[PDB]
Amino acid sequence: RVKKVREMELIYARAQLELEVSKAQQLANVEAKKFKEMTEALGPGTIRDLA
Amino acid sequence: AMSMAVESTGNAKAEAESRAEAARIEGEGSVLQAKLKAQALAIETEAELE
């Protein structure tokens, strides 16, 4: 019982802890993508002089 | 004094013999009960695992 409850919870938590990383992976892409679409569209040199 | 000896031993041991004999029933009973409890929890915890 204690084997097949923690072991079956492990394979369940495995496919959820890795599902958690895919969420953060795709959200990191749209962040860096939308960051790239602004930093170059604004100006590679303009960011330097503005600060 | 030989009657005093067989009085104390025969009486006190017979009381201590019965409680040990009763404890044997709990021991053999608990084995069969735990064996039945295994199936009870097995069918419960395994079938509910689905």
Q: Three-state SS across chain A? A: CHHHHHHHHHHHHHHHHHHHHHHHHHHHHHHHHHHHHHHHHHCCCHHHHHC
Q: Closest residue of A to B41, CA-based?
A: A1
Deposited experimental method: X-ray
| Among B50, B31, B49, CA closest to A1 | B49
**Can you give the resolution of this entry in Å?**
3.5
CB contact under 8 A, A8 and B46: no
Q: Are residues B46 and A4 in contact, defined by beta-carbon separation less than 8 angstroms? A: yes
Q: Does B12 touch chain A (CB under 8 A)?
A: no
Q: Does B49 touch chain A (CB under 8 A)?
A: yes
CA atoms within a 13 Å half-sphere pointing along the CA-CB vector of B16 = 6
Q: How far apart are CA A33 and CA A48, in angstroms?
A: 20
HEC sequence for B1-50: CHHHHHHHHHHHHHHHHHHHHHHHHHHHHHHHHHHHHHHHHHHHHHHCCC
Q: How far apart are CA A13 and CA A10, in angstroms?
A: 5
